[PDB]
Amino acid sequence: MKDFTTYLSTAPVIATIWFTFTAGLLIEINRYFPDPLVFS
Amino acid sequence: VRPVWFPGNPPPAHLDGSLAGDYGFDPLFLGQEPQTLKWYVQAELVHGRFAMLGAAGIILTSIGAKVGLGFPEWYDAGKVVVEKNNIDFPTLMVIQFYLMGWAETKRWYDFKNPGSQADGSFLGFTEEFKGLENGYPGGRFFDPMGLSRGDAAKYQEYKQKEVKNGRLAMIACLGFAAQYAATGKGPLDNLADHLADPNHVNFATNGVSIPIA
Amino acid sequence: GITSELQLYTTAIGGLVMAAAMFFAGWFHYHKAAPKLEWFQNVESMLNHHLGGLLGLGSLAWAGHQIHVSLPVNKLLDAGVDPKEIPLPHDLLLNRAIMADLYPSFAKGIAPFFTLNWSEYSDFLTFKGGLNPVTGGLWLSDTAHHHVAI
Amino acid sequence: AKKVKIAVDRNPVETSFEKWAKPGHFSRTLSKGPNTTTWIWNLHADAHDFDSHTSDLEEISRKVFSA
Amino acid sequence: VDRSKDQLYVGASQSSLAYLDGSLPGDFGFDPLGLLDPVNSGGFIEPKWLQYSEVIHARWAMLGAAGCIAPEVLGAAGLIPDATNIKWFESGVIPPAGSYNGYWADPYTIFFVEIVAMQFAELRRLQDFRYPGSMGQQYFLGLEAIFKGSGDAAYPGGPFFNLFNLGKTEAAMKELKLKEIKNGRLAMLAMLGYGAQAVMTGKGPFQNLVEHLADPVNNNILTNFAG
Amino acid sequence: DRKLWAPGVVAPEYLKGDLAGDYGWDPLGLGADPTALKWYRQSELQHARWAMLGVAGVLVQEIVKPDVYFYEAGLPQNLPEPFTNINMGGLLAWEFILMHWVEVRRWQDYKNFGSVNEDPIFKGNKVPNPEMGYPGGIFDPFGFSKGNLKELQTKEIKNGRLAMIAYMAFILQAQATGKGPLAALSAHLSNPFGNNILKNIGTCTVPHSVDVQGLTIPLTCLWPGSQ
Ligand code: CLA
Ligand code: CLA
Ligand code: CLA
Ligand code: CLA
Ligand code: CLA
Ligand SMILES: CC(/C=C/C=C(C)/C=C/[C@@]12O[C@]1(C)C[C@@H](O)CC2(C)C)=C\C=C\C=C(C)\C=C\C=C(C)\C=C\[C@@]12O[C@]1(C)C[C@@H](O)CC2(C)C
Ligand SMILES: CC1=C[C@H](O)CC(C)(C)[C@H]1/C=C/C(C)=C/C=C/C(C)=C/C=C/C=C(C)/C=C/C=C(C)/C=C/C1=C(C)C[C@H](O)CC1(C)C
Numbered sequence: 001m002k003d004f005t006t007y008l009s010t011a012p013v014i015a016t017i018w019f020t021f022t023a024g025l026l027i028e029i030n031r032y033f034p035d036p037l038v039f040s
Numbered sequence: 041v042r043p044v045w046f047p048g049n050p051p052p053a054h055l056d057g058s059l060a061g062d063y064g065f066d067p068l069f070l071g072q073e074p075q076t077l078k079w080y081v082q083a084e085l086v087h088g089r090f091a092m093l094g095a096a097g098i099i100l101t102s103i104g105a106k107v108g109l110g111f112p113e114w115y116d117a118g119k120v121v122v123e124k125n126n127i128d129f130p131t132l133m134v135i136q137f138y139l140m141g142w143a144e145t146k147r148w149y150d151f152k153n154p155g156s157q158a159d160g161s162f163l164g165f166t167e168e169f170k171g172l173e174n175g176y177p178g179g180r181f182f183d184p185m186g187l188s189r190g191d192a193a194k195y196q197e198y199k200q201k202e203v204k205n206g207r208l209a210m211i212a213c214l215g216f217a218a219q220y221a222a223t224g225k226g227p228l229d230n231l232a233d234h235l236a237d238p239n240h241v242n243f244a245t246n247g248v249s250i251p252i253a
Numbered sequence: 254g255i256t257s258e259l260q261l262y263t264t265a266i267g268g269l270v271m272a273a274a275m276f277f278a279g280w281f282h283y284h285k286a287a288p289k290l291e292w293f294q295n296v297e298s299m300l301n302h303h304l305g306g307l308l309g310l311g312s313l314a315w316a317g318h319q320i321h322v323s324l325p326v327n328k329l330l331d332a333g334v335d336p337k338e339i340p341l342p343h344d345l346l347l348n349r350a351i352m353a354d355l356y357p358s359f360a361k362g363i364a365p366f367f368t369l370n371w372s373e374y375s376d377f378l379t380f381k382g383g384l385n386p387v388t389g390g391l392w393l394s395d396t397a398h399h400h401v402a403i
Numbered sequence: 404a405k406k407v408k409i410a411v412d413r414n415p416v417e418t419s420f421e422k423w424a425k426p427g428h429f430s431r432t433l434s435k436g437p438n439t440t441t442w443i444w445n446l447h448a449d450a451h452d453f454d455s456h457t458s459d460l461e462e463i464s465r466k467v468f469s470a
Numbered sequence: 471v472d473r474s475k476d477q478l479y480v481g482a483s484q485s486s487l488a489y490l491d492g493s494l495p496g497d498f499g500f501d502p503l504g505l506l507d508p509v510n511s512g513g514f515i516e517p518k519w520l521q522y523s524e525v526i527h528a529r530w531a532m533l534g535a536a537g538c539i540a541p542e543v544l545g546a547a548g549l550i551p552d553a554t555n556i557k558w559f560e561s562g563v564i565p566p567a568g569s570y571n572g573y574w575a576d577p578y579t580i581f582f583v584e585i586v587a588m589q590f591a592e593l594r595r596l597q598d599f600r601y602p603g604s605m606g607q608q609y610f611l612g613l614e615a616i617f618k619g620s621g622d623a624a625y626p627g628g629p630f631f632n633l634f635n636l637g638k639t640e641a642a643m644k645e646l647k648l649k650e651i652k653n654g655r656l657a658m659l660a661m662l663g664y665g666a667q668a669v670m671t672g673k674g675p676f677q678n679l680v681e682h683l684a685d686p687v688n689n690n691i692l693t694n695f696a697g
Numbered sequence: 698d699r700k701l702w703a704p705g706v707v708a709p710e711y712l713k714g715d716l717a718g719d720y721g722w723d724p725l726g727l728g729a730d731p732t733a734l735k736w737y738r739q740s741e742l743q744h745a746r747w748a749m750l751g752v753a754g755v756l757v758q759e760i761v762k763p764d765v766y767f768y769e770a771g772l773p774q775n776l777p778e779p780f781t782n783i784n785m786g787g788l789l790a791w792e793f794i795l796m797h798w799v800e801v802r803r804w805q806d807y808k809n810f811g812s813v814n815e816d817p818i819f820k821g822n823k824v825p826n827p828e829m830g831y832p833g834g835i836f837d838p839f840g841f842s843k844g845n846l847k848e849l850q851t852k853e854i855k856n857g858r859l860a861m862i863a864y865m866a867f868i869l870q871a872q873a874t875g876k877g878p879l880a881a882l883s884a885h886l887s888n889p890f891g892n893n894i895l896k897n898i899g900t901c902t903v904p905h906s907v908d909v910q911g912l913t914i915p916l917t918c919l920w921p922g923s924q
Contacts, residue, residue, distance in 0.1 A: 001072040006424035048597030048604035239575040244582055253578045283469035284418050286411040286513040290461035293468070298407045347566060349697075364696035406485060410510035551899065574921035612733055615726030630724045635706055 060196075061203035082151060082175040088206020095209040098216055102228045113226040114216065222248040254326035256336040308403075316400035321346055324377055324393050325355050331387045415465070429456050471500060494521055495644070496651035518623070522599065525624040528654020535657040538664050542676035557674035558664065599623040670694050717850035718858070735829070739807060742830045745857025752860045755867055759877045768871045768903075773910060785910055872918045875902035899923050 007013065030036070042057050044050075044064040051057070051064025054072045059081060071077035097114075104111035112120045122129050150157050150171050158170035172178035176199070178188045188195050219230050223246060233241045243249040255261060282288065322342045329339045345352055353360040356376045365373035378398040385392050427433030427446050437443060449455060453466045472479035478487075482499035489507050490499050494517075501507075506517050514520070538558035545555025553572065560568030562577045573580065598605045598619045606618035619626040625647070637643030664675050671678060671694055681689045699714050701707075701721045708721025711729055716738060728734040755767045769775060773782050780788075805813045810829055816822035824834035831850075833842050841849065867878045874881055874897050884892050901922025906913050 001069055001076070003420040003424045007420055010424075010426065043608050046597075047594070047608040047610070048601045239579060242579060244578040245576060250578055253576075279469040280418070281513075283465055284416045285414060287415045287465045288468065289410040289412060289510060290464060291405070292410050293464045295407050343566060360697070362695055362697050367695050406504065408504050408507060408510075409515055411512040412510070413512045549895065612727045612730055613725055615729040616724070629709065629726055633724055634703055638705065 060199040061207065078174050079151070085175040085203065085206065088203060088210055091209035091213045092206055095212045095216075098213075098227060102226050105226065106228045106232070115220055115226075222246050254322045254342060256326065256339060312400045312403045316397055319393060319397040319400060320377060321352075324397060325352060327388075327393050328355055331385070472498070495647035496524075496655065522624045525651065525654065527658055528651060531657040531661050532654055535660040535664070538661070539675045542674045546676065557668075559668050595623075598626065717847060718854035736807070739830050741854070742857070744861055745854060748860040748864045749857055751864045752867070755864075755878060759879050763880075766871075766875075767867075767877050768875075772907070785912075869919060872901055872903055872922065873897040874900075 042051075042062070042064075046065075049064070051062075052066055052069065052072075054069075054074070054077065055062055055064050055066055057064075066072075071080050101111045101114060101117065105113060111117075121127065122132070146157050146162070146169070150169070151174070155170050158166050158168075160166045162169065168179040168181040169177075170179065172188060176188070177183070180186075183189065187198065216227050219225075219227060222243070223230055225233075244253065247253075322345065325345050326339055326342065330336065340348075340351055349359055349362070358365070358373045358376045361373055365371060371378075377394050378401065379392060379394040380398065381392045381395055383392075384390060422428045425434070427436070427442070430449055433442060433446055433449065451470070453463045457463065471481060476498065478499040480500075481502045483502060485504060486499055486501040486506075490497050490501060505515055506520060508517055511517070514523075541550065541554060541556055541558070544550045545552060554570075556570055557568075560570065562569040562573070565577075569577070594605050594617065598617070602621055602623070603618055606614045608614065610617070616628050616630045617626075618628060620628070637646045667673075667675060667678050670691065673681075699719065699721075706721070708719075709723050709726070709729070711731070711734070712719055712721045712723060723729075728737060758765065758767055758770070765775060773780075773785055776783060802813050806826070807829060811826060814823050814826050822835075824832045824836060826832050826834070827842075827846075831842070831846075870876070870878065870881045873894070874884070876884060899922060901918035901920070901924055903916050903918050905924070906915050908914075
């Protein structure tokens with residue numbers, strides 16, 4: 001298992017997870033707060 | 041030499057038989073790292089003990105509903121309690137995470153630092169929160185009858201019973217959810233229907249589990 | 254001859270089973286039973302199997318699907334029959350009488366093939382050419398004879 | 404005349420995640436790790452160039468077949 | 471292939487005789503595709519698995535060949551009611567071909583029992599091939615005493631699988647293994663015959679025999695191409 | 698040197714003729730564990746002795762009261778005049794209390810042999826209990842055990858094993874034909890060919906359930922017979 005979790009820590013895999021998470025957060029915010037153009 | 045989940049296959053190296061309920065079952069090597077295994081041992085015990093409470097609670101109330109004492113089904117109890125007693129759902133939910141948050145966080149930091157909760161910081165209590173083993177608190181509060189402070193051989197037997205009954209309860213709770221989804225009825229409505237006609241009322245004839253049938 | 258979402262869905266499941274099998278074969282033939290160099294160098298045997306087996310049997314099998322499924326279903330579709338009233342493909346396979354209605358030569362079974370009376374199958378093995386005037390595509394009876402000949 | 408027959412080797416390569424955690428393992432040049440960003444591009448350009456990783460034709464063929 | 475008994479069958483080749491030395495039961499030197507050559511063997515194409523699999527197919531086929539025709543024969547003799555006198559392919563194994571309603575449960579209820587029963591029987595048998603003698607070690611309600619095997623997966627023997635300890639001598643046991651394999655190969659071909667004849671004719675194996683005897687010239691495969 | 702269950706078989710290494718009625722028969726090797734053999738020998742005696750009472754009860758009752766079907770004698774309305782329509786719950790209360798006592802007394806003897814030989818109220822009364830399962834003393838008032846005990850034990854187990862098979866024959870015959878053992882025998886003799894198992898095996902004459910003073914008791918045949 002140590003080696004497999006080491007593989008999951010490589011740059012492409014971390015980038016995939018982090019950007020999947022970051023994209024999910026941005027998509028879900030726009031799902032619940034649609035069409036935001038200004039801060040009120 | 042000890043019995044294993046798949047007779048003939050040697051147990052994996054990291055399952056040496058010391059833990060309760062050790063049958064060499066870890067085909068995905070999820071607990072290979074010793075520090076991960078300690079965390080998972082406690083996770084299995086917390087899951088098992090919650091499942092045992094849930095299975096017994098579901099079974100008892102289902103019996104009461106079956107014999108017409110007025111209890112709701114487990115999948116309807118939540119709505120009936122709040123509406124009948126005029127309880128704010130969000131307020132009850134917040135109180136639950138306060139009380140569970142306090143107990144869980146103290147358990148969390150005893151795993152990270154064993155015996156750290158016994159320094160007297162919580163209201164002056166010292167021994168009751170020292171802990172005995174990973175996942176086995178012990179002491180006067182968690183073991184008031186001291187069944188872990190008597191016969192060592194008896195204590196090990198109880199550990200084997202606890203985890204096995206715990207695993208069975210976890211499976212049973214999975215059954216309650218699957219059976220409610222398939223049949224839409226309560227656990228003892230399902231049991232009563234099966235007993236009336238075992239050959240023709242089972243998962244193979246419920247119209248869901250075997251779609252091709 | 255696909256007419257329902259169920260038939261499409263079942264093919265998708267089978268594709269995943271094949272996908273798993275391909276990935277298993279790749280692991281198996283590299284980590285477990287890896288061929289030796291002499292196995293790869295049997296170019297004569299490889300060509301025999303890829304010509305007769307991969308292409309020959311593949312074409313024969315597909316011709317089998319066309320004769321027993323594609324042609325009957327597309328014949329009824331081009332006649333205005335509603336897709337849900339068309340017999341399911343296995344009913345065509347198991348009931349020679351239904352096929353004999355669409356193609357009378359089916360009433361004679363496979364005997365004309367074995368007696369070299371191949372002209373009997375002219376009702377579903379054709380040489381029309383051109384295009385089907387209803388659908389604008391090739392006659393499926395032509396493609397079926399094509400794949401038999403191939 | 405050589406007989407046409409099935410011929411394999413049993414268990415040639417152990418199934419393990421050890422090399423997944425060692426980028427560039429397949430090549431003698433890259434297996435030592437990066438010192439410049441050119442290493443990163445070289446890792447991907449050479450990944451499937453099997454014959455540049457070894458001269459054994461049998462080893463190349465097995466990689467081709469499973470790929 | 472040469473039927474009957476012979477020193478070597480038709481398909482025997484000088485190449486096959488290099489490794490087919492006659493030790494295995496039923497070794498008539500017939501391996502034209504050379505699937506039993508030990509050199510550079512692996513996977514499931516190896517002498518042990520292939521010989522084990524042939525016996526397994528032989529034993530299932532012998533049950534199937536007798537079981538796929540028994541209801542028709544006993545039904546003809548009147549020993550069983552006509553309601554259970556059914557063709558092997560109409561018993562519910564292939565519902566599109568016909569099914570029998572009258573079992574104590576629907577075939578999918580029965581099938582689940584088959585899965586659980588066969589998983590235990592089959593996976594335990596597998597472990598004796600992978601780890602010889604391992605099924606006699608772990609507790610199995612005291613039944614592990616009869617699952618020790620003998621070191622040869624195809625012939626476990628023991629107090630149950632060899633109930634009457636037949637073939638006590640090596641010569642006798644060798645003779646019996648030959649008889650088991652030849653009856654098994656005959657049964658395997660019979661099952662293939664049942665399947666092809668069902669598709670070709672749509673009738674049961676017993677009807678096909680009765681009709682061929684009634685008029686052999688007008689009832690055979692050649693006349694069954696047409697209708 | 699004793700005769701075994703079959704010719705040419707070899708007795709298990711743990712069956713040396715010490716026990717009465719030892720034919721070296723253990724196909725499933727259930728007795729290989731020495732602790733299990735002692736327990737299984739006790740249960741064999743219980744089945745043997747209860748079965749012999751069962752056969753004698755069915756046979757004697759059928760002769761004395763031919764009009765009563767032993768299979769249905771358990772219904773309260775069929776009880777003799779003094780006990781007719783007795784509360785079955787109160788009747789079960791006596792049996793549970795009294796059988797629990799004697800069975801736990803017998804059970805504790807297995808757990809710790811020789812520990813419950815003495816009367817618990819009137820001290821001084823004891824049973825010899827020479828062997829487990831053979832109390833003696835008050836249980837052998839006529840003193841037959843003071844002789845060739847081993848021969849008698851052989852006779853007991855031989856007749857007991859025969860009675861076990863005999864009683865299950867009564868049960869299956871009752872389910873298939875709905876007649877008692879002697880009534881079934883008379884039916885066979887009158888029409889040996891028209892009345893036998895070949896025709897009756899397909900019929901199960903037991904209802905699906907019966908009502909006993911307001912409690913519905915499920916019933917079942919031993920096979921999926923046609924109701
Ligand atoms: C879980 C099983 C498993 C494990 C643990 C291993 C382990 C190993 N294999 Mg084996 N292998 C497996 C399965 C496995 N293999 C399978 C299923 C196949 C068939 C394809 C093979 C075929 C194979 C070959 C041919 C070779 C190995 C080799 C290796 C070694 C290096 C692996 C490596 O660096 O991977 C890291 C690589 C990756 C993560 C790339 C994954 C590529 C796959 C096909 C998915 C790509 C999909 C993706 C969507 C493509 C488009 C991307 C786009 C969307 C951006 C190592 C001992 C190599 C070696 O040196 O052995 C001695 C070698 O030459 N393996
Ligand atoms: C690969 C292609 C292919 C396939 C699979 C089929 C298949 C079929 N064709 Mg078609 N056909 C094809 C190509 C094909 N055809 C071509 C190219 C032509 C043009 C010349 C035709 C022309 C044609 C005609 C004119 C007719 C058919 C018919 C049939 C059906 C009956 C055949 C028959 O009598 O078999 C005879 C016997 C066999 C094929 C042997 C079967 C052997 C079985 C599977 C053995 C099983 C053994 C095993 C041990 C069993 C275990 C059981 C288990 C439960 C234990 C069948 C569905 C007939 C029909 O009724 O169609 C609806 C029919 O009339 N075909
Ligand atoms: C390009 C494809 C390909 C090729 C060339 C090979 C080649 C080889 N494989 Mg591999 N294999 C493949 C794909 C392939 N495999 C796939 C997809 C899988 C996953 C299921 C496997 C799983 C596999 C295993 C588990 C084994 C091999 C073995 C072998 C060797 C002997 C094969 C043999 O005896 O075949 C002759 C064929 C048979 C003995 C009977 C196969 C019967 C199949 C299952 C049914 C018919 C399939 C047919 C093409 C389509 C039927 C359609 C319809 C009528 C139903 C050989 C090196 C063996 C080995 O390593 O030997 C040393 C071995 O043990 N292969
Ligand atoms: C592996 C081979 C095989 C398989 C899968 C089948 C399958 C089938 N056979 Mg076939 N059969 C076979 C071999 C096989 N047969 C053989 C070799 C013969 C010749 C002897 C027959 C003769 C035969 C006949 C005559 C009939 C079938 C029928 C059937 C069907 C119903 C089965 C049934 O009701 O079982 C019932 C279940 C059992 C017999 C097993 C009993 C299981 C219980 C739980 C055991 C209890 C044990 C207990 C200790 C009591 C022991 C008492 C004893 C000592 C007296 C089914 C399709 C029937 C059919 O086609 O109906 C339409 C039918 O009439 N078969
Ligand atoms: C392989 C054996 C086999 C199997 C699987 C079946 C299966 C079935 N039989 Mg059939 N049957 C068989 C043999 C078998 N039968 C034989 C040999 C006879 C003649 C004695 C009969 C007589 C018979 C009748 C009269 C009826 C059935 C019926 C049935 C159904 C079950 C319900 C029932 O009443 O069973 C009863 C049958 C048995 C308990 C026979 C058990 C046979 C065992 C498993 C095999 C060994 C028998 C052994 C050689 C001793 C035979 C007797 C002896 C005196 C020679 C089912 C389809 C019933 C049905 O649905 O009819 C429409 C039904 O009415 N069977
Ligand atoms: C106890 C018994 C019967 C008891 C009957 C009684 C009290 C009946 C009472 C009544 O009837 C009356 C008087 C009058 C009725 O109005 C009322 C009732 C109440 C109905 C039968 C046991 C019957 C028991 C039987 C038949 C057991 C058979 C066991 C066999 C054959 C085992 C074989 C093997 O186990 C070996 C030995 C070794 C292994 O290696 C291999 C295998 C094959 C597994
Ligand atoms: C040798 C050699 C050599 C070289 O080298 C190569 C080659 C040539 C390739 C080879 C060959 C081979 C072959 C020929 C084979 C064959 C096989 C078979 C036929 C099988 C069967 C097989 C078969 C089988 C198993 C079968 C089985 C069956 C069964 C169980 C059945 C059952 C049943 C019954 C009773 C009845 C009911 O109602 C139904 C059922 C359910 C159905």
